[PDB]
Design a binder for this molecule. Structure first.
Ligand SMILES: Nc1ncnc2c1ncn2[C@@H]1O[C@H](COP(=O)(O)OP(=O)(O)OP(=O)(O)O)[C@@H](O)[C@H]1O
Ligand SMILES: Nc1ncnc2c1ncn2[C@@H]1O[C@H](COP(=O)(O)OP(=O)(O)OP(=O)(O)O)[C@@H](O)[C@H]1O
Ligand SMILES: Nc1ncnc2c1ncn2[C@@H]1O[C@H](COP(=O)(O)OP(=O)(O)O)[C@@H](O)[C@H]1O
Ligand SMILES: [Mg+2]
Ligand SMILES: [Mg+2]
Ligand SMILES: [Mg+2]
Lengths: 240, 474, 470, 56, 475, 119
């Protein structure tokens, strides 16, 4: 796939997109053939040359002065263990990364993206703007505070805690459900047709949740909706 | 004789027969022009590590002995160029035009050839200068999980050394080649490249060159050290060096250990990190100083390579992910960061101010871990908690903006002596900025003395200046 | 004569072949000294220790210095004996490496010095001592609450910046001054920035004249690092065997002796055991500790620091080492911050001598009460931290008072402290501290200002020091 | 009300003392399970490595 | 019958020849140091060196002794300090033995054994009353470091003076100073006249430690088959397990749980199953064994601990927090059991104290609840009062055994409730005084229990205990 | 052999209902390890009382235990074992204390063992 995309980048000079599905299955194949080639084993039954092969393949997938390749990959986390060698070696090559977590998928929050473990080189005050960055980091404080507080709630109970702690749990529930969305490919999985939210709208809405304007609405209204306008109507049907 | 022939070729290892007079650690030359290092010598088979593309070496091709131990090119011409681990130019721009060479397997400076670290390295980061002092000739570990500030902390250090009479080297190991380019253009923009060397080992290269990359970087810095100028070195991941030695050894079929790591791992890292010293006055008073980086998976401080680098250094700066996602930036954990050469690398002024803060942050970490929520506790406990929040907002700092030392001592004098109690926690980040403006326009006399005498001025005058600004602030 | 030649080389490991079949024994030592024949070569001055007889008249060897630069066929010669280091009065006040060479720029020890082996058969059961004896260190906290024993292994666990280097130096001064015995410092795997500071402090404290030091650096291959304890040991053996005096051996960190053993087991090709440690952990550890014994002529006592590998005391390195230890002294930072030196925690330190058969009954009663008094205060401390001193019941105040005086009377004015302060310092015999603490526990001296007890010696000194205030 | 409020505050204080003592005991019991699991994981990985190495 | 050494490394050698060598044979090198043949590969014999291995070099001349591993036995060994091989160590010249026995004996088979019907009185109140041992039993003392293990065994040997027993002490992996000290301690109490001490201290090569327990049972079985009763103590079986792993992982035998070669259970059983009570046809002899295992974290649940908890007829678990809380000896009643016990007590002791072991576990839990508890009831408070006295009645002092007739009398007071009147600290002094009084005044009670192993008339005993209580005074 | 047709519907309904009470108490155990039973409310309190009764009423006196404890043994026929569990599950024996339910064979034996205590 890469030699075809390279010819379009270099000689034709058009910009190009690459979609590679399960680049872990490349790393896994090497292991199977390593023992029969005569190589001694390393770490968790892996080839004695893991970094070297990942580097050769990945260092070709670049955007040169001649032309650009945007490259989008699915990476398989081998045994639900992000501390495994194949993912650890992969994290060193990306510019933006979203990690998907099964605990969120169990709660039904789709897409199940970790809002803390996901990172990009474009979240910089000059690359996205001051208004965008302010809202983004403030959401990340709310969700990290909810994580530590859940331990205290699970053993001692929610009523035991302060008004500021109560207001964090209030907002964090809404923020976490409002990160879920109705896709067009989820037309088959969920009946409902789907939505596209422009960036300006996303910033307005998340700012309202943080400032408390929409806190009167019931929390179930924020699940699988696209724009904040929709959340107001969905609540009306419930009767609020 | 001095000619042999390749019998096995695979994965960047080859095996040769013959070459009877070879030494361990020699350079050997193949027909293709690719170079190599002899690391094993059995009775019939010489074992060769290839330092280049190994897609043109066939079985039965000739290999010939150079006669030199492994040598890296050194000279003043390397400054401002992007280079390979071997002395080969990469930025384009033509040859490096070096004059001489040094071994990459130098002995370290002995006891009786060393002195005591006695002078500072001003990093311009409020937390690193006040709380975790690095002095010239020390070995400091930056250890932490991925995405926590790391390359940010080293790049700030190089820039803040512009005025000082320093030489700095950056050794980029295993990193994607666009990321090294982003740091370089960034350094050319801040004007840093004029006094620095970047040594590059990208992820596409044979493992062996990633292994030599940290040794080549100290071998360049030691040339300037024995000539008398002070030098600083940063290694961009020692965990990526440790992976490349394991691959080379397991293809050379040597016996494993804890996690497939060869039994030489402590010997390899120690040989590299003990070449850091402050030489004595007889040696001309030069100094190396070193900043290894280690990345830890799920913060396993107990892993094989992490247990080993935490030991060889003279301190550590452990960085935490939750502090980052909580607004503390740089995300430096005060409890797990220790310097054992601390107390001598600060200017006389900073030692008096910094001592109280270490006690103050501690009496908050213990109290806060239980009592932040309690609405009313004893009046003291309220006093400690309030100054506790202000201390964690005075230590916060922005990206790519270093602070000169005289201004750091003044803001730390004001928090410690209680001038900042009246100010609320949210505006502590602005009271800071307004104070820096007021000090420049009006208080030129106080700043004159601290730079020249490293000493603090008369208390009445300082109290007068700071109290007067507290009148102006709203 | 006969000679071997080198036939394999890999990192720290080398193999030699001895064609006649006249071969060296399992712990003997071999020299390579060679002058470069052509400008392609590098001159070499290496030495090697034997490890295994592999077969085909070949021998596997670990190397004591860097093996870079070795050509196959290079000749090699056998000394007929293990590594041997010089012993006697010659080695006092000097610094040496594992081999026995002097590292100090203080000349070279001559050929005539008697040189004796690192490896030797261990002491026998017809040679040891029937009755335990207690060693008087002159330090109040140590002699009262965790008595040291002649022939004992003592363990120091403490944090950085608590007084370790001062406590080691004061012990070396008290034993040399009062009991008339030398000391040895063997730094196994030590950072070269610490060795320099230690040599300057040992010199500037005046202690140097009574001690001999071996330094094995971190940058040495594992075999040198492992056998550095075995040379410091063989020097202390001459002083017990011949001069008959009692001797003291300090080991910088025993964990690095076990780590170097693991790294040599991996180079040599052995199968790892639990937690990836050598398959011969307790035969290595035992063959070190079983030479630190109190024979009839005299004794060796040892203070050894140990690192807990992961804060896990159930690990195979702590397990094997703690099997041999007789006392444990732990140093606390809180006390240090407050002003107590020596900074030793009375409630986390242990001895096997603190039993009424060895110490006698008067000492045992006095000691237990001190521990009972201090522990109760640690409880009232959190009550006094939350609420006021008036709130305590009267009986509880009668325990607060005694505890504060007892905590301070543990503090002592050292002689090596006069570089860090301006006062002379004192030595206290065990009978005088046992008598004094009995007076404090009966309350005879409670009419006194608190700080009267700070950094003092005998209890009668408190009386006079009180008058000084008024 | 005087007796009621005084008795309520004392009841929370012992309930809190016993709760803290149960939690600290559970921390030592759990800590030992973590160390036994950590040492077994490091003896499995080294035996699989050496088993493949002995075969090849 | 001649071979030649090809590899000599790590304590295991190999040799080329020795054609008629039997497996298990003792092998003599040219040097005169000894060895055991354990393996016979087609051209090479594999030899374990049983001595210092630094004098043997490839090219040496191993020779064949002609005898299977054999340990010297005879009456002359009693009172001497000896090696695992029959070699004298104390000085004092030769051992002057007469004959030998294999160290690889079979255990007395079924139909050659009987049930236990005679006591092994330890003179320790908690062990004799709560966790009984009879001749022929295999009993495990388990614990952590510094809990009382050597102290309980040595108290047993001194008290087995009066009774016609032979006692053997086998010190495996111990520091040499502790062993020399034990011999002087036994000589002072006069114990050495009827005992053998067998030594394998830590500086020696691992093979003589592995053989050390098998030499100790091989000496004791000679006396057993001749009819006299014997006891054996093993000072660390967990250090025997460690030395077997080191010897196996050097012969490249594959690992397992921990890294223990699977043949740990077979090793421990081969030793422990030679303990037996022979029947009257065999002359009614007896071995008995008290193996010791140390446990990490003071946790009963671990590999080598559970393996020996399988081979024995009970266990005595000693606890470190009890030890630091003044309870000495420090015995946990709930986790300590005797499976052959119930027949091994004298008749008076069965009647006096059989419900003590189970009732005392109940106090341990009810005390733990009561401290955190606020208000208790009368039937819980009465149980809490007797439990405190029992714990002080089971406290003893070092090197002071109590004769069994005196044990049943002090326990009768506690179970029948006469001791309820006395305040707690006084219980230890009340016990020293009652024993003195029994000696001076109450001789008739002490004559009856010894001959009939039986308890006297209740009226006379109740009269006597009230008469002592009048004479006793308090605080 | 636990299937309606093999055991009869009465035995099957009794066995499944006993296993449901025991699983709820293996989850309540995580919270009662720390706080005790103040945190528990309503159904949690009633479930822990009945689980304590059930867990001790599964313990028996054996004829082979006579060599260890002086008690005589008991044989409980199947029709009797099912009847006892049902009365425990209904709550007909809520008043009797937990120490009377240990080491016995039939429900009649628990009533006389309670009467010996009088609690
Ligand atoms: N002091 C700071 N203030 C604000 N943002 C910061 C600061 N330091 C780092 N960051 C930001 O956080 C991230 C730090 O990335 P950086 O490359 O410094 O970490 P790293 O550990 O080198 O990452 P990697 O593991 O990918 O090498 C970037 O988004 C950066 O802009
Ligand atoms: N009943 C007792 N009363 C008083 N002191 C005792 C008693 N039992 C043992 N001790 C003392 O307590 C310590 C126990 O050591 P001992 O050797 O008995 O324990 P151990 O478990 O065998 O030790 P180790 O694990 O070191 O081999 C010794 O000082 C011993 O003399
Ligand atoms: N006995 C003492 N009397 C006075 N000051 C002391 C004493 N012991 C230590 N100190 C002080 O504490 C410091 C501790 O330094 P040092 O013992 O070298 O630390 P470390 O434990 O890291 O080796 C001393 O240099 C001195 O400042
Ligand atoms: Mg980086
Ligand atoms: Mg020190
Ligand atoms: Mg013992």
């Amino acid at each position: 796939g890469l030699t075809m995309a390279e010819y379009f980048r270099d000689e034709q000079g058009q910009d190009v997109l690459l979609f590679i599905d399960n680049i872990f299955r490349f790393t896994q194949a090497g292991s199977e053939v390593s023992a029969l080639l005569g190589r001694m084993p390393s770490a968790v039954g892996y080839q004695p040359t893991l970094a070297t092969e990942m580097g050769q393949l990945q260092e070709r997938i670049t955007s040169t002065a001649k032309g650009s390749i945007t490259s989008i990959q699915a990476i398989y986390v081998p045994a639900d263990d992000y501390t495994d060698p194949a993912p650890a070696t992969t994290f060193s090559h990306l510019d933006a990364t979203t990690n998907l977590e099964r605990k969120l998928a169990e709660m039904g929050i789709y897409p199940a993206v970790d809002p803390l473990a996901s990172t990009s080189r474009a979240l910089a005050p000059e690359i996205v703007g001051e208004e965008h960055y302010q809202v983004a980091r403030k959401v990340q404080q709310t969700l990290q505070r909810y994580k530590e507080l859940q331990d205290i709630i699970a053993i001692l109970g929610m009523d035991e805690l302060s008004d500021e702690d109560k207001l964090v749990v209030h907002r964090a529930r809404r923020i976490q459900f409002f990160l879920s969305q109705n896709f067009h490919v989820a037309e088959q999985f969920t009946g409902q047709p789907g939505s596209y939210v422009p960036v300006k709208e996303t910033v307005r809405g998340f700012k309202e949740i943080l400032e408390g304007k929409y806190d009167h609405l019931p929390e179930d209204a924020f699940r699988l909706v696209g724009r904040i306008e929709e959340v107001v109507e969905k609540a009306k049907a419930m009767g609020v | 004789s001095d000619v042999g022939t390749v019998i096995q070729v695979g994965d960047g290892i080859a095996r040769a027969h013959g070459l009877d007079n070879v030494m361990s650690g020699e350079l050997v030359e193949f027909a293709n022009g690719v170079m190599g290092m002899a690391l094993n010598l059995e009775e019939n088979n010489v074992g060769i590590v290839i330092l280049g593309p190994y897609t043109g070496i066939k079985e039965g091709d000739e290999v010939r002995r150079t006669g030199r131990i492994m040598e890296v090119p050194v000279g003043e011409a390397l400054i401002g160029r992007v280079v390979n681990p071997l002395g080969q130019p990469v930025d384009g721009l033509g040859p490096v035009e070096t004059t001489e060479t040094r071994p990459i397997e130098s002995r370290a400076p002995g006891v009786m050839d060393r002195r005591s670290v006695h002078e500072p390295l001003q990093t311009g980061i409020k937390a690193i200068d006040a709380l975790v002092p690095i002095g010239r000739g020390q070995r400091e570990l930056i250890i932490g999980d991925r995405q926590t500030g790391k390359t940010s902390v080293a790049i700030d250090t190089i820039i803040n050394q512009k005025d000082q009479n320093m030489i700095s080297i950056y050794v980029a190991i295993g990193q994607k080649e666009s990321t090294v380019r982003t740091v370089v253009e960034t350094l050319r923009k801040h004007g840093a490249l004029d006094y620095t060397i970047v040594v590059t080992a990208s992820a596409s290269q044979p493992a062996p060159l990633l292994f030599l990359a940290p040794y080549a970087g100290v071998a360049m810095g030691e040339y300037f050290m024995y000539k008398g100028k002070h030098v600083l070195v940063v290694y961009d991941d020692l965990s990526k060096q440790a992976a490349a030695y394991r691959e080379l050894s397991l293809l050379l079929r040597r016996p494993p250990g804890r996690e497939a790591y060869p039994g030489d791992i402590f010997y390899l890292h120690s040989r590299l990190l003990e070449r850091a010293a402050k030489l004595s006055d007889a040696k001309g008073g030069g100094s190396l100083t070193a900043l290894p980086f280690v990345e830890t998976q799920a913060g396993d401080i107990s892993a094989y390579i992490p247990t080993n680098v935490i030991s060889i250094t003279d301190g550590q700066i452990f960085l935490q992910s939750d502090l980052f996602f909580s607004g503390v930036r740089p995300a430096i954990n005060a409890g797990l960061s220790v310097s054992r050469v601390g107390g001598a690398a600060q200017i006389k002024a900073m030692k008096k101010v910094a001592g109280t803060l270490r006690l103050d942050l501690a009496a908050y970490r213990e109290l806060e871990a239980f009592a932040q929520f309690g609405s009313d506790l004893d009046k003291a406990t309220q006093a400690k908690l309030a100054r506790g929040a202000r201390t964690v907002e005075v230590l916060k700092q922005d990206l790519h903006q270093p602070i000169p030392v005289e201004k750091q001592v003044l803001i730390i004098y004001a928090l410690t002596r209680g001038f900042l109690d009246d100010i609320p926690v949210e505006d502590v980040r602005r009271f800071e900025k307004e104070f820096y403006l007021f000090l420049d326009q009006n208080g030129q006399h106080l700043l004159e003395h601290i730079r020249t005498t490293k000493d603090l001025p008369n208390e009445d005058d300082l109290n007068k200046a700071i109290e007067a600004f507290k009148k102006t602030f709203v | 004569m006969t000679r071997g030649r080198v036939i394999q080389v890999m990192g720290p490991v080398v193999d030699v072949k001895f064609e006649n079949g006249h071969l060296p024994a399992i712990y003997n030592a071999l020299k390579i000294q060679h002058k470069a024949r052509n400008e392609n070569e590098v001159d070499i001055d290496l030495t090697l220790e034997v490890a295994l007889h592999l077969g085909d008249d070949t021998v596997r060897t670990i190397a004591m210095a860097s093996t870079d630069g070795l050509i196959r066929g290079m000749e090699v010669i056998d000394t007929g004996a293990p590594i041997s280091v010089p012993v006697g009065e010659v080695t006092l006040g000097r610094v040496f490496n594992v081999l026995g060479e002097p590292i100090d720029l203080e000349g070279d020890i001559p050929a005539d010095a008697r040189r004796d082996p690192i490896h030797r058969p261990a002491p026998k059961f017809e040679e040891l001592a029937t009755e335990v004896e207690i060693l008087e260190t002159g330090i109040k906290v140590v002699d009262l609450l965790a008595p040291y024993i002649k022939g004992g292994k003592i363990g120091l666990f403490g944090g950085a910046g608590v007084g370790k280097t001062v406590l080691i130096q004061e012990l070396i001064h008290n034993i040399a001054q009062e009991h008339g015995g030398i000391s040895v410092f063997a730094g196994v795997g030590d950072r070269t920035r610490e060795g320099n500071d230690l040599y300057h402090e040992m010199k500037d404290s005046g202690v140097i004249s009574k001690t001999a030091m071996v330094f094995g650096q971190m940058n040495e291959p594992p075999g040198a690092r492992m056998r550095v304890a075995l040379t410091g040991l063989t020097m202390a053996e001459y002083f017990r065997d011949e001069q008959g005096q009692d001797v003291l051996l300090f080991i910088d960190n025993i964990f690095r002796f076990t780590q170097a053993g693991s790294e040599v087991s991996a180079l040599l090709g052995r199968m790892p055991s639990a937690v990836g440690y050598q398959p011969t952990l307790a035969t290595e550890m035992g063959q070190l500790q079983e030479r630190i014994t109190s024979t009839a002529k005299g004794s060796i006592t040892s203070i050894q620091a140990i690192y807990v590998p992961a804060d896990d005391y159930t690990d195979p390195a702590p397990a094997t080492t703690f099997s041999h230890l007789d006392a444990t002294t732990n140093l606390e930072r809180k006390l240090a911050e407050m002003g107590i030196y020596p900074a030793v925690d009375p409630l986390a330190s242990t001895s096997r001598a603190l039993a009424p058969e060895i110490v006698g009954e008067e000492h045992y009663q006095v000691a237990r009460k001190v521990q009972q008094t201090l522990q109760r205060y640690k409880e009232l401390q959190d009550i006094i931290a939350i609420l006021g001193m008036d709130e305590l019941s009267d009986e509880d105040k009668l325990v607060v008072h005694r505890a504060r005086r007892i905590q301070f009377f543990l503090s002592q004015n050292f002689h090596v402290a006069e570089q860090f302060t301006g006062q002379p310092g004192s030595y206290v015999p065990v009978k005088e501290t046992v008598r004094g603490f009995k007076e404090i526990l009966e309350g005879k001296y409670d009419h006194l200002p608190e700080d009267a007890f700070r950094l003092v010696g005998r209890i009668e000194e408190v009386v006079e020091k009180a008058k000084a205030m008024g | 009300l005087l007796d009621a409020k005084a008795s309520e505050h004392a009841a929370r204080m012992t309930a809190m003392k016993n709760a803290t003592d149960n939690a600290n005991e559970l921390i030592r019991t759990l800590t030992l399970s973590y160390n036994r699991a950590r040492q077994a994981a490091i003896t499995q990985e080294i035996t699989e490595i050496v088993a493949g190495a002995n075969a090849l």
